[PDB]
Amino acid sequence: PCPGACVCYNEPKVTTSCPQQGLQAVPTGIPASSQRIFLHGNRISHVPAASFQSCRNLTILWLHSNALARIDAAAFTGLTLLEQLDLSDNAQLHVVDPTTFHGLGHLHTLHLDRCGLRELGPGLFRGLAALQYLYLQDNNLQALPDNTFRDLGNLTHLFLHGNRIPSVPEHAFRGLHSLDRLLLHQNHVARVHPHAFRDLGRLMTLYLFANNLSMLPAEVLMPLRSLQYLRLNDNPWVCDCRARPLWAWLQKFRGSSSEVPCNLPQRLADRDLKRLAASDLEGCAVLPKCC
Numbered sequence: 354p355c356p357g358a359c360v361c362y363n364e365p366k367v368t369t370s371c372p373q374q375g376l377q378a379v380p381t382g383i384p385a386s387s388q389r390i391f392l393h394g395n396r397i398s399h400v401p402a403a404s405f406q407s408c409r410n411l412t413i414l415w416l417h418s419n420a421l422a423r424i425d426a427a428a429f430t431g432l433t434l435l436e437q438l439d440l441s442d443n444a445q446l447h448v449v450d451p452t453t454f455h456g457l458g459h460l461h462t463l464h465l466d467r468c469g470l471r472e473l474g475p476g477l478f479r480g481l482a483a484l485q486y487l488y489l490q491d492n493n494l495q496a497l498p499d500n501t502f503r504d505l506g507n508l509t510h511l512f513l514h515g516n517r518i519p520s521v522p523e524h525a526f527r528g529l530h531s532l533d534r535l536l537l538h539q540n541h542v543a544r545v546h547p548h549a550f551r552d553l554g555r556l557m558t559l560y561l562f563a564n565n566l567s568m569l570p571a572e573v574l575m576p577l578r579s580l581q582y583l584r585l586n587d588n589p590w591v592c593d594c595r596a597r598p599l600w601a602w603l604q605k606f607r608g609s610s611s612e613v614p615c616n617l618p619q620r621l622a623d624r625d626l627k628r629l630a631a632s633d634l635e636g637c638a639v640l641p642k643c644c
């Protein structure tokens with residue numbers, strides 16, 4: 354018995370599809386045999402506890418482009434086979450309770466982009482051992498706490514761009530041994546801890562453009578054995594003695610890198626640090642280390 358104006362069909366997967374119907378709540382009577390539930394484009398403001406618990410075989414659930422303001426901590430309880438979860442484009446969600454994703458051990462992709470998220474609570478991504486793709490871009494994040502991604506040993510793509518992250522601490526990206534792509538551009542990153550990328554030996558793409566970096570210790574990039582694509586443009590680089598280690602690393606990098614445009618000193622403005630001679634990097638500009 355297909356509920357409301359929903360469309361129900363069996364092939365290729367048992368599906369209940371109710372998009373863009375002005376629904377203000379999760380409809381009652383969703384067939385328990387459903388493998389895919391599409392509830393995107395509605396006006397759903399709240400997801401109550403155990404809203405899909407009847408659906409033992411659910412693998413795909415879309416709730417994007419709704420009006421979500423609150424998700425109950427037990428909203429996804431009993432969804433042990435869930436592989437894809439889409440909560441994106443709910444700009445007033447602001448906050449997800451840290452236990453909300455517990456028991457989703459088959460989850461492969463999690464869409465949380467444009468959810469207005471203010472923070473990543475302790476244990477929010479705990480136990481998501483199968484997760485491969487995590488989308489956190491275009492939110493309101495102000496911090497990247499240590500060990501936030503510690504259990505995500507299978508994650509290959511992490512999207513964190515378009516937030517307000519001020520820095521990267523040492524253990525922010527611990528546990529991410531499979532990470533392939535890390536996008537951190539369009540943030541406020543003013544400093545990266547020397548050993549922040551220790552676990553990212555398989556990383557192939559790193560975007561750090563449009564941030565607030567004036568220098569980078571060479572130790573930051575040393576672990577990145579597999580790196581092929583690097584973006585560092587649109588940062589206020591100081592091209593003086595402090596930039597020598599980054600310069601030296603860039604000389605031996607066999608991958609592709611963006612411009613690394615000097616902001617200071619004036620005579621080097623918009624020249625590419627990558628393309629300077631060592632002699633250009635003598636003295637202090639207008640303190641740390643060599644200065």
Ligand SMILES: *[C@@H]1O[C@H](CO)[C@@H](O)[C@H](O)[C@H]1NC(C)=O
Pocket residue numbers: 385386387407408409410
């Ligand atoms: C889940 O799938 C199995 C195998 O098709 C079936 O026996 C079971 O009834 C399904 N569960 C629900 C709630 O429909």
Ligand SMILES: *[C@@H]1O[C@H](CO)[C@@H](O)[C@H](O)[C@H]1NC(C)=O
Pocket residue numbers: 482483507
């Ligand atoms: C991680 O992926 C590999 C293959 O890519 C798979 O064998 C393994 O079971 C996955 N880990 C978990 C915890 O699901």
Ligand SMILES: *[C@@H]1O[C@H](CO)[C@@H](O)[C@H](O)[C@H]1NC(C)=O
Pocket residue numbers: 541543565
């Ligand atoms: C970059 O960091 C400096 C402090 O070193 C701060 O004064 C400035 O406002 C920051 N820029 C942006 C765009 O946040």
